[PDB]
Amino acid sequence: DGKNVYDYIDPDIDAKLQALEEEEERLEKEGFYDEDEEEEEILQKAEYIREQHALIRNEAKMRKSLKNRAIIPRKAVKKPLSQLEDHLDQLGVDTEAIGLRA
Amino acid sequence: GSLAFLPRKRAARHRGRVKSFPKDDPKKPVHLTAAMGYKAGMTTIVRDLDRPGAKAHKKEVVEAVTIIDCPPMVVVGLVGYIETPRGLRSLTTVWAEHLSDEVKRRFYKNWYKSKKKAFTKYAKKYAENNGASITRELERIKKYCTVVRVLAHTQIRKTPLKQKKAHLMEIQINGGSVADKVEFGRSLFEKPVTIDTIFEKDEMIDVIAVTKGHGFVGVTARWGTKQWTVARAGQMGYHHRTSVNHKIYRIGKGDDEANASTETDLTKKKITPMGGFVRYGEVNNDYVMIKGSVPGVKKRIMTLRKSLFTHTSRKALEKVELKWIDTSSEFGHGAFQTAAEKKQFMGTLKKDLQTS
Amino acid sequence: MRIENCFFCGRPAWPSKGITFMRNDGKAFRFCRSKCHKNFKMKRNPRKLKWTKAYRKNAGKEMVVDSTLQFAARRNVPVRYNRELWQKTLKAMERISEIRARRERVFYKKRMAGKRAREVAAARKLVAENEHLLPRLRGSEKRRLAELAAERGDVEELEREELAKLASKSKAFGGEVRR
RNA sequence: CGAAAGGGUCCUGUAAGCAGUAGAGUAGCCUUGUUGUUACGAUCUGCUGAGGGUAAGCCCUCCUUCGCCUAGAUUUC
RNA sequence: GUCCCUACUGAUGAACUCGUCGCAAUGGUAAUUCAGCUUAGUACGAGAGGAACCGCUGAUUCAGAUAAUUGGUUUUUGCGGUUGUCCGACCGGGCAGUGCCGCGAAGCUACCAUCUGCUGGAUAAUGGCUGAACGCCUCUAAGUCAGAAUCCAUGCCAG
RNA sequence: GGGAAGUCGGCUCCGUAACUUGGUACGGACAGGGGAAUCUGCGAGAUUCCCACUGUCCCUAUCUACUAUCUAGCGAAACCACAGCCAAGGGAACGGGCUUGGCAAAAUCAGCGGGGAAAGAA
Ligand SMILES: [Zn+2]
């Protein structure tokens, strides 16, 4: 099993082996091998933030483009009632409270 | 090149044919000549050499050996030939009953859309008291034929291959009267025959295969340059070859669970390399371990046959004491025989903590 | 036969594997791979390359003081053959291997001991500094659950329940343009 | 059967980020500092043989997940 | 100072219903040289020197394969380092017709790696048996035995 | 950049003291650098290797130029008596059609190294 039998050959090996089990049995008797909700949920929350940061970073790379392309300003493109409603909803706002303005 | 391997053409058949069985005499016992297998790969070994007269005598030498997956073959027929002034003529063949779907796939070319109707009338010939006719065919073989061969096919569905179509061939029966050979084949009907039954360890054999193709290649590689006698450009590779005198070093039983273990290495391990044979998979069946290189790519059909002539060398009368078989990865510079050895060497890991 | 050890990295060097370099001073340099050989030829320090047993032992990534490692060493004084001795040695080798595995598990556990406290502290800081990117329901969802809580007679637990449901249960890019 | 995924096996060589006064150094507070403080910080160390790639001509899959499927065209004594 | 047919080399192919398993006419044809051990310090020889048959093990060239290992090769653009410039900086990346460097699987290669190369008959020079021509004699006239890396075949490639 | 080949290739000066402007004795200095490594505990650190010329050859590197299979579409020219399988023979160093033999089986694809080109004679 990947070891040299001749390298392990040693006359008078019973004394050394019995010393090995004796020291092992000690190790268990002291406890050398004795293995020892809020944390889970806060770790899950941190994982959720990390996901959100990347999903924003991915949006950033999606619109970024490579080399300095002139972009029509935001004040010149018009955005829909449906899209503003969805983001503000995802942001947690009563869209039904107000919005017949446009 | 050699004017002895010309007309440098692609092999007409992928299987490769024996083209010569050893000559037959009735005094020897009844036996089969050839067998079949699939090239799985090749590995490295160390043999304690006993070549009296060699400088490596009583020393350990490192050798390369080819491994052949050999699932047991099934006997499904018996063919009888007669001698004529024009050569051998196949007088008649009588099949087995209950042929397998793999041999029927061999018979069919589009098996999926077909009504799988092969040999149904022949099975009815067995069942419906036309066994008189079948016995008549057996007796015709007994009383008219001079050489008898047996129809046998491999077990792809045990071989780790995407293929499903088996391979038929005739293995010649030698050593007995025609009646004895006919009875032997008839009794061998519907039965698996093993490679340790056909061959055994220490025996040199002959391997028939189709050597790997390389397509249209110029004279520089086609012949080995710096009328048929002049080197020309054309097909190089994919050539039928019969390679002689290859020593059978081991036959592993597949179910042994310690195929790669020797009397020197006490490691319970099998022949399959750590991670599997590259482009082939795992060998889970009987396997044949033979010295040296052998024609054919991995997963290629291979024919193994007995030597035509009784041997003239001391390399064919030698015992092969194996010391260890390499089971490291062939997918790169592998240095561990087993996953247990790799884990013991590298300790425990972060994913080990995460899973446990 | 014998299992060799690579001079550079320490992986098991089996027969056939590797190249051996014979220096003129008379010492042999056995390598297990072309990687190790080329690293030695470009004269890099295995004590500095992190994928080597030399580096790992130097940085204390492996246990180096233990009877399970004192039990095996190169023997220059032969012992007369004895079947009981070899058989008992094989059994002792099995015992030693599994004891070594358990000790190394404990060692790596002790080395990885403090990780959870650091991870939870990082989570504390991240959540405290980014409270605004947490799940924050939906406005229409709130209105519908307000109506449902009015029907069923509570609002807080309906919230903290369907919030959990939606958290237990991705955004595409763009959309089809009408033809 | 196909696409993913998981595990195995190989290749590279220790990810991003955070932290420890380890930290060569760069500067402010108040007065002497015998142990003064506060910030930045190469480089180091730890989390970390981690991180990434892995069949495209690597290996395996017990219900790992999803999907597919008895077709439609020609020709034949 | 006047791109075509064909040979050769490979690859497809209509008709004989498709298919599987075969046979073998004919054509091609392959192995080669050296060394070491034993025989044996023997036969032989005054001495100096000094073989061979059987048996065994290697090497040259040639031929046919093969990739476990070991080198080489890298668009795995796989991973890492690094130059110039750029994306405001970090991160992550583009460009330099593959920027440069290191390692690098897989595949491909290499007497830079490894494996394999097989036996019957008939003959030539020649040496014989029986025995005439020719009452001796004679291997020849009738009859017949052996014998060369030669010839024809098997093994081998095509079909 | 590397390998190969040939070679004959590798491995005195300043100050001081007497003498006729120059020599004479004394004191001090001189008669390397670069690159690659190995060994002992960065160390006077110790030890090992390579440095050449050529009107020579080859290979690697860079640049320049020509370099290209199939499919859809488009689309010539050169050249063309008719043809194209061999061996012997066919008096005029003449054969491609003739004699008599070897033979000889549709339709094609690709490669290409042979043939379908040569004198005139003092
Ligand atoms: Zn190594």
From Swiss-Prot, chain A:
Record localization: Nucleus, Nucleolus
Signal peptide range: none
Coiled-coil annotated spans: none
Function of the protein: Involved in the biogenesis of the 60S ribosomal subunit.
Family: Belongs to the TRAFAC class OBG-HflX-like GTPase superfamily. OBG GTPase family. NOG subfamily.
Protein name per its UniProtKB record: Nucleolar GTP-binding protein 1
Lineage: Eukaryota, Fungi, Dikarya, Ascomycota, Pezizomycotina
